């Protein structure tokens, strides 16, 4: 379970 | 389960 | 289950 | 199950 | 479980 | 469980 | 359990 | 349990 | 248990 | 238990 969350997500 | 969420998502 | 969601999604 | 959803989706 | 969250996430 | 969170996350 | 949190996180 | 926290974290 | 905390953490 | 804490921590 890889969870990446937030107002601005930049990968 | 790879979950990426947010107001602006940039990959 | 790869879930990508948000107001602006840019891949 | 690959789910991509949001107001503006840009691939 | 790798969780990365916050207002601005930059990877 | 690797948890990285905060207002500005820079990796 | 590796927890790194704070207002500005810089790795 | 390796915990690193504070207002500005610089690694 | 290795705990490093403070206002400005510089490693 | 190795605890290092303070206003400015410099390693």
* DSSP H or E segment with residue E4: strand E2-5
Give the Cβ contact number of residue A9 at 10 Å.
27
Q: Where do the DSSP E strands lie in chain G? A: 2-5, 8-10
Cα–Cα distance, D3 to G7 (Å, whole number):
31
This entry's atomic model was obtained through cryo-EM
Q: In 3D, which of C11, I5, H10, B6 has the Cα closest to residue F11?
A: H10
Judged by CB atoms within 8 Å, which residues 1-11 of H form the interface with G? Answer: 1-11
Q: In 3D, which of G6, F6, D4, F4 has the Cα closest to residue I8?
A: G6
Cα–Cα distance, G8 to I5 (Å, whole number):
13
Cβ atoms A1, C3 nearer than 8 A: no
Residue holding tokens 């691939």?
Answer: D11
Give the tokens for residue B7.
């107001």
Q: In 3D, which of E6, H8, G3 has the Cα closest to residue F6?
A: E6
Residue holding tokens 């969350």?
Answer: A5
Q: Which residues of A touch E2 (CB under 8 A)?
A: 1-3
């Amino acid at each position: 379970d890889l969870i990446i969350k937030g107002i601005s997500v930049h990968i």
